[PDB]
């Protein structure tokens, strides 16, 4: 009484769903091709080289595996009888390539998340020895490692079995009456997948906390002191008598000194001797000198030059210390966009792979007894279907994240919260 009825089945009878496979493969192909057109041509970081590698790996997965399932389902035959020149080799190759692509894609996503976390958190280590060579030599290394790793059943540590209705093939997990060389590969594969997913989630969380720290540091010093300066200039320009002028000027002077103590998000690695900080400090010094001469002229002696001095101060403020503020804000928004793209990709990958791990651990050593006929094959097919359908959704995320009007509305949406 073998667990799988359809292990030796040589024919297929089902509900003509080959056209559905055709339309899904067509949608995936057009999504991949439009995504590879859009940014890689019009738009043109180390993030985007990794994204490009991910898209091309996914495209080569779709162009290779969906044709075989569609052809077997269309010729009205099982996967052992679809091609007469090779009966078992088709099943072995199908399962081998499915597992290999599934592992390599997850390794690439983990590398993406780890690189972004390191870049956002620790800038000195990131700048020291991470460049476009690293972002260009990720996919060959991880793909070679996964292709070397997924060859154990061809060596003697696992088994590939055809799943009912005979149109799919995958590693066997529900074991014999009892064995030691069939538990090993299944649990090792699922353990690796779980560890990769956990590491990816942790890296995402760390990067988010570092970006929050950056936002708070920007929002305190420069931005609140700028608001104070604007309010003090307004209250000077709308005032009568020379009593409150001294108090407003002193509040403005204190705010200017505190703001001069601040640090922009960029050109912060080298605080001294940087021209981008030196002219910042020079502009604040000029503003403080103007405040000092206004105080001397209109406060030690009574005269109404304070309004003209305030107008001159506003004119020299609105000239060449707005560029730093605007550059800082723009940098923060582009960082937030990169993190959102990572978050969506991570959510998809973590969701659509846990059924496989759960099924592998459920069929192994957690079985006093299992109802076997109508309750395990229909459950086994779903995990394979989800692991396959990861491929369709991947490039459409990038298309929507770089759409003409859709991404514009999206960016207008998520900035507010």
């Amino acid at each position, epitope marked *: 009484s073998p667990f799988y009825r359809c292990q030796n089945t040589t024919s297929v009878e089902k509900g003509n769903s080959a056209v559905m496979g055709g339309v899904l493969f067509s949608t995936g192909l057009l999504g991949n091709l439009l995504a590879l057109g859009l940014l890689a041509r019009s738009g043109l970081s180390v993030f985007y080289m990794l994204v490009c590698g991910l898209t091309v790996t996914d495209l080569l997965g779709k162009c290779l595996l969906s044709p075989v399932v569609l052809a077997a389902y269309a010729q009205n035959r099982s996967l052992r009888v679809l091609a007469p020149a090779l009966d078992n080799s088709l099943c072995q190759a199908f399962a081998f390539f499915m597992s290999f692509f599934g592992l390599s894609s997850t390794l690439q996503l983990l590398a993406m998340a780890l690189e972004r976390w390191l870049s956002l958190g620790h800038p000195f280590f990131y700048r020291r020895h991470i460049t476009l060579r690293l972002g260009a030599l990720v996919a060959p290394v991880v793909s070679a490692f996964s292709l070397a790793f997924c060859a154990l059943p061809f060596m003697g540590f696992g088994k590939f079995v055809q799943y009912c209705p005979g149109t799919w093939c995958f590693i066997q997990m529900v074991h014999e009456e009892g064995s030691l060389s069939v538990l090993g590969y299944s649990v090792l594969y699922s353990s690796l997948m779980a560890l990769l997913v956990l590491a990816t989630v942790l890296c995402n969380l760390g990067a988010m906390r570092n970006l929050y720290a950056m936002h708070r540091r920007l929002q305190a010093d420069l931005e609140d002191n700028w608001e104070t300066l604007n309010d003090n200039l307004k209250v000077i320009e709308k005032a009568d008598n020379a009593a409150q002028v001294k108090d407003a000027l*002193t*509040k403005m*002077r*204190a705010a200017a*000194l*505190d703001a001069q*103590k601040a640090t922009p998000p960029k050109l912060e690695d080298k605080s001294p001797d940087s021209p981008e900080m030196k002219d910042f400090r020079h502009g604040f*010094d000029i503003l*403080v*000198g103007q405040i*000092d001469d206004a*105080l*001397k002229l209109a406060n*030690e002696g009574k005269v109404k030059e304070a309004q003209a001095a305030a107008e001159q101060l506003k004119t020299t403020r609105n000239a060449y210390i707005q560029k730093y503020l605007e550059r800082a804000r723009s940098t923060l928004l582009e960082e937030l966009d990169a993190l959102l793209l990572l978050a969506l990709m991570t959510v998809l990958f973590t969701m659509c792979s846990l059924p496989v791990i759960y099924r592998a651990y459920y069929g192994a050593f957690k079985d006093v007894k299992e109802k076997n006929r109508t309750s395990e094959e229909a459950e086994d097919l779903r995990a394979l279907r989800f692991l396959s359908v990861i491929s369709i959704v991947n490039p459409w995320i990038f298309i929507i994240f770089r759409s003409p009007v859709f991404r514009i509305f999206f960016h207008k949406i998520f900035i507010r919260p």
Partner: antibody
Amino acid sequence: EVQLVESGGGLVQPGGSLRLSCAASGFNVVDFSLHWVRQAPGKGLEWVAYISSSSGSTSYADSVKGRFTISADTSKNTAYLQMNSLRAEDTAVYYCARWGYWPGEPWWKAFDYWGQGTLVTVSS
Amino acid sequence: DIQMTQSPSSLSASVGDRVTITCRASQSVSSAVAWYQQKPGKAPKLLIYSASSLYSGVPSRFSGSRSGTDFTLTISSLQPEDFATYYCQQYLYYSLVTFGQGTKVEIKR
């Protein structure tokens, strides 16, 4: 080689007059602002008046203003404080101190040098 | 008229103690706060000049810190020559100078 030495303090009747001279040494009075400070017997410190000769700027404390005046002679390198309506509350020890100009570190260090002080007592 | 409040007024300690004095400002003066030491029959001396900076010639056991318009002067291990009176000053403009009230330290028996 920087010093600040005062003179001209002594016993005067209430309502009298007295001129206190602060004679800077080792630096030019034109390039530094200078201030007057006083301390009552068994009490704390208190600021009195301010002159900057380069800008011609002059300020006084609330009680001092209207009664005392301050002048500077650059050739003589001396600052004067003329005291015209002296009362019993003026009995104290007086100090003249310096302060530098913005920008730079000279402004950030407030009172790096004082004088030894002179005692003014008002009693009939 | 920015005011300064100094605590405590009288302190009794022994040689080798750790001493902390606190000054508080009414408004924000950024970091423009100084500390002075005076002995009977003498002119005041400067120790700290930017709420964290040591003047030349002052021994390193004197420390100063700033947090939220609260300023702290610390002596890590008191020495017999540190029995004097201490003042805190704010300086913002040439006409804006204010002193504290003082704190005297003496010997415990």
